[PDB]
Curated annotation (Swiss-Prot), chain A:
It holds the Pfam family Ribosomal_L23. Belongs to the universal ribosomal protein uL23 family. Keywords: Ribonucleoprotein, Ribosomal protein, RNA-binding, rRNA-binding. One of its GO terms (cellular component) is ribosome. Transmembrane segments: none annotated. One of the early assembly proteins it binds 23S rRNA. One of the proteins that surrounds the polypeptide exit tunnel on the outside of the ribosome. Forms the main docking site for trigger factor binding to the ribosome. GO terms for molecular function: rRNA binding; structural constituent of ribosome. GO terms for biological process: translation. It comes from the Bacteria. InterPro entries: Nucleotide-bd_a/b_plait_sf, Ribosomal_uL23-like, Ribosomal_uL23/eL15/eS24_sf. This is Large ribosomal subunit protein uL23.
Curated annotation (Swiss-Prot), chain B:
SUPFAM superfamilies: Translation proteins SH3-like domain (SSF50104). The keyword rRNA-binding applies. It comes from the Bacteria. InterPro entries: KOW (IPR005824), Rib_uL2_dom2 (IPR014722), Ribosomal_uL24 (IPR003256), Ribosomal_uL24_CS (IPR005825), Ribosomal_uL24_KOW (IPR041988), Translation_prot_SH3-like_sf (IPR008991). Belongs to the universal ribosomal protein uL24 family. One of its GO terms (molecular function) is structural constituent of ribosome. Keywords: Ribonucleoprotein, Ribosomal protein, RNA-binding, rRNA-binding. One of two assembly initiator proteins, it binds directly to the 5'-end of the 23S rRNA, where it nucleates assembly of the 50S subunit. One of the proteins that surrounds the polypeptide exit tunnel on the outside of the subunit. One of its GO terms (biological process) is translation. This is Large ribosomal subunit protein uL24. SMART domains: KOW (SM00739). It comes from Thermus thermophilus (strain ATCC 27634 / DSM 579 / HB8). Part of the 50S ribosomal subunit.
Curated annotation (Swiss-Prot), chain C:
GO terms for biological process: translation. The gene is rpmC. PROSITE patterns: RIBOSOMAL_L29. It comes from Thermus thermophilus (strain ATCC 27634 / DSM 579 / HB8). PANTHER family: 60S RIBOSOMAL PROTEIN L35/50S RIBOSOMAL PROTEIN L29, LARGE RIBOSOMAL SUBUNIT PROTEIN UL29C. The keyword Iron-sulfur does not apply. Part of the 50S ribosomal subunit. GO terms for molecular function: structural constituent of ribosome. NCBIfam families: L29. The keyword tRNA processing does not apply. Gene3D superfamilies: 1.10.287.310. One of its GO terms (cellular component) is cytosolic large ribosomal subunit. This is Large ribosomal subunit protein uL29.
From Swiss-Prot, chain D:
One of its GO terms (cellular component) is ribosome. GO terms for molecular function: structural constituent of ribosome. This is Large ribosomal subunit protein bL28. The gene is rpmB. One of its GO terms (biological process) is translation. Belongs to the bacterial ribosomal protein bL28 family. It comes from the Bacteria. It comes from Thermus thermophilus (strain ATCC 27634 / DSM 579 / HB8). The lineage of its organism: Bacteria, Thermotogati, Deinococcota, Deinococci, Thermales. Keywords: Ribonucleoprotein, Ribosomal protein.
Length: 92, 100, 71, 93
RNA sequence: CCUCUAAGCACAACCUGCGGGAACCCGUACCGCAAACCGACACAGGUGGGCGGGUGCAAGAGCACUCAGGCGCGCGGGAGA
RNA sequence: CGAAUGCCGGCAUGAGUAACGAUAAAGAGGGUGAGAAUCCCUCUCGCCGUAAGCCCAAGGGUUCCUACGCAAUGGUCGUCAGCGUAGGGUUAGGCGGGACCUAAGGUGAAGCCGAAAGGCGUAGCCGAAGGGCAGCCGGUUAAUAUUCCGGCCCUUCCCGCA
RNA sequence: GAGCCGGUAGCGGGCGUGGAUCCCUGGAUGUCCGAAUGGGGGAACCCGGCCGGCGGGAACGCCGGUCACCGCGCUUGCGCGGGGGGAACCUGGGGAACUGAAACAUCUCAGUACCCAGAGGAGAGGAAAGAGAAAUCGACUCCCUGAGUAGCGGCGAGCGAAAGGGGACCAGCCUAAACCGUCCGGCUUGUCCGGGCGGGGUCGGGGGCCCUCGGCCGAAUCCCCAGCCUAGCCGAAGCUGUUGGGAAGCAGCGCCAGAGAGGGUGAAAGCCCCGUAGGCGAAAGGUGGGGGGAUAGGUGAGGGUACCCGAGUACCCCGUGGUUCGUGGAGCCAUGGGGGAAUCUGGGCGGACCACCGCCUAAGGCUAAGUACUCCGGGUGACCGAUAGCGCACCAGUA
């Protein structure tokens, strides 16, 4: 558990801007709750989580030759870290 | 597994078609294709390097597949189909009036 | 790999539920760390991932066999 | 519906209209002037009965009424009661 | 939501302050009188609710011009029966 | 197989014809590019203005933003696009629904009825655009905002205190 | 037993005689919906109680367990069962019309189609209250006969048996009731009523109860094996030359054959490959009297009493169904309604009914096999060969 709820990090110009505040954001397994996430992260980076905003992403639907399909849908959570704290791991 | 056949990475004599009578080493086997390799069939493929890193890739171009029924293994003597001996414990292949 | 696996089991098979749990928790983490730098390109050697998911399958499979007559 | 005792249930029968002198008299004989489906029902009735403490009714064909006053006599030799109007009938077989 | 009493219980329990904590799931783009909805079409057709400025004509959501805003309607160029 | 206003398919004729979908209307100068009446910019001209403007429901479901494209789609053209490729984008205790309520109606303990399937039906449960209920004004993005940020303001649980 | 990391091509990386991939067996894990079963619901989504665990966790959220309903039992809880699915095939409950009759109503299509319920590898049926004229036969099912006969029939259209014979298969059993014991709960507390267990008893004449005589077969049940299915393995014998891109053609000279089925190999090959003839093989899980075992079970005469031989049943009448039988002279089988017996002097039947003569013992239940069907595995074809063959050779029940 815990390292199953957090999947990867976003990676976008939008998501980066975020790091100025303690606002790091992650692809997160879509059945997880705001609470699940908060605790999952608390243990993943020993930082203190102060606010969670979550949102779903309809997976884009794409093609290859006559084979028409979808990408998997996702959920991303954008998590606030306490003032002073930061996640060094995400600072690339 | 339904795939299996005669020879492996070793010396084999071709009896094929163009490369009839040929003797080549290791056949580098498929067997998806029931094909092998030897130094038998050869052709030119056209190129410009997958990336023109070290520009051209070159031009001599290497060996075609060749049906595994074209080759025939060999030892003290010639071609010979393979036969299969008990060994008293395991199981190896010996050629007709020969061994391995 | 194959012999490595053979041994990975040998130890795994003599640990205790308690300890398996803790070890898993660790491999689970390494895996996250992989899929992170998997996902930025910047260092990633493919096989290393399938390799660790199975590592973990192995442990949890073992943890199941433990848990029947022991805890 | 059905007799709780006998198992009797409405059966399907024909309604045949005829005309004519029966052959066995003047003759020519009869001629069916219409047949059609219909049902015959068992003569179902209601039997309220005391038994143990509680009241218990049956749905039962008139032919079989006595058969109930047999059970009530077979029921005497039993251990029963315990707020169970329906649970009696069940145990009443 | 108020109030009344029942078993209960009154070392509970409500009421009023005040402090500190806790606060899930789902939706949230964009179109939306329309080329993105129903009409096989970028169809002159249909589609519920709200805002809908100014001047003048007796009034008004009418009529003419016009703000904000938005458009010239996804084939053109000539002739002048 | 030569006929069935035959069956499937392909290819003719009408034919370079009728048409190109509102008579609100265009013009020029610059850009761009292989190529521009049709794309970008500017200036003139016209049309809408209880709209042809703005905002919401339903419906649609990525059509949104950006970078590349121009075979096809677009009734012409196309460098443009709602088209193709890729990558981005939807953030809520207070907005709306759900961990509240009931309406018609549906379901349905008991109860009743029906050859079987099933039909009724009290309490209860479901059922909303109706009741109840705590957020305003600004600022930020290429694309979200009462959701992010700033300022001010509220509501519910749990715990402690008086 | 030498290559792998699916339908492979590529980037980027790894594994394998330290015996991988792959195949068979068993096991583990198995989100959510669905009989769907904590509750709700617009299927795959919302929302709960209880037990225990995680986080600073009391609010909050996560993880594990668990909580539908109905039916049977035994002390109100706990056990068993049920539920839903399945290509056909089966049984049962309901049940049409076009059509045919050259109109149409009786009749036909047809107890067909279809709907419902149920059963299973099958289902049904099954050990005579049978047939039917034979000093007769002897459960049931299925095939061939019998026979388009007997008959039925607006004697129209049309419908259409059975005995018998020839075959496949082979199998017979357990209860109820007298009577005996025992437990229980009532009362009118009796030499008794009736409820439950056990014993006994099962038949064309038998059983119980009283009086004289004491011995083998054997399961459809359980067990062990044989065999059989789910991967496999072994398997004879050819070289050279010649044309040709390419031999397997053509030529020379050989060989194997329980193998000269068939496919492939650059064209046309018994002897190159995969095979074929012939013969091996299972630790595991399925299957399995076929061959063994072992239980359950079954093993008498007379002579007396006449105590019992399945009830709203038989029987009769009314109304209908089934049978070849359409009210006919109309039995038999079944039964919605009314009336309503007897226990072998008992009772049904042999085509109204009487009388002889004969057949059989109803109102409780179980029973393999021989039979049907083809989702599925395999084998064959004077079957198709892409407008054919399945709708689908192709990512189709799709667009």
């Amino acid at each position: 558990t815990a390292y199953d709820v957090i999947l990867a990090p976003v990676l976008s110009e939008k998501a980066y801007a975020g790091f100025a505040e303690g606002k790091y954001t992650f692809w997160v397994h879509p059945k997880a709750t705001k609470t699940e996430i908060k605790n999952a992260v608390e243990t993943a980076f020993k930082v203190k989580v102060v606010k969670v905003n979550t949102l779903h992403v309809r997976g884009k639907k794409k093609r290859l030759g006559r084979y028409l399909g979808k990408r998997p849908d996702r959920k991303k959570a954008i998590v606030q870290v306490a003032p002073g704290q930061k996640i060094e791991a995400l600072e690339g | 597994r339904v795939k299996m056949h005669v020879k492996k990475g070793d010396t084999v004599l071709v009896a094929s078609g163009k490369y009839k009578g040929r003797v080549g080493k290791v056949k580098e086997v498929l067997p998806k294709k029931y094909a092998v390799i030897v130094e038998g069939v050869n052709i030119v493929k056209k190129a410009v390097r997958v990336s023109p890193k070290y520009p051209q890739g070159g031009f001599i171009e290497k060996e075609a597949p060749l049906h595994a029924s074209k080759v025939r293994p060999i030892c003290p003597a010639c071609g010979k189909p393979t036969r299969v001996r008990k060994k008293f414990l395991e199981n190896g292949k010996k050629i007709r009036v020969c061994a391995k | 790999k194959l012999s490595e696996v053979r041994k990975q089991l040998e130890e795994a098979r003599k640990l205790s539920p308690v300890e398996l749990e803790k070890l898993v928790r660790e491999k689970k983490r390494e895996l996250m760390e992989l899929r992170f730098q998997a996902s930025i390109g910047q260092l990633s050697q493919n096989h290393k991932i399938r390799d660790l998911k199975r590592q973990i399958a192995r442990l949890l499979t073992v943890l199941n066999e433990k848990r029947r007559q022991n805890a | 519906k059905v007799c709780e005792i006998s198992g009797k249930r409405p059966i399907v029968a024909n309604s045949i209209q005829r005309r004519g002198k029966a052959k066995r008299e003047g003759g020519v004989g009869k001629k069916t002037t219409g047949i059609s489906k219909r049902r015959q029902y068992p003569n179902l009735q209601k039997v309220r009965v005391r038994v143990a403490g509680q009241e218990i009714t049956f749905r039962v064909a008139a032919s079989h009424i006595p058969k109930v006053y047999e059970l009530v006599e077979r029921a005497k030799g039993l251990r029963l009661e315990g707020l169970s109007p329906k649970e009696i009938k069940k145990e009443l077989l």
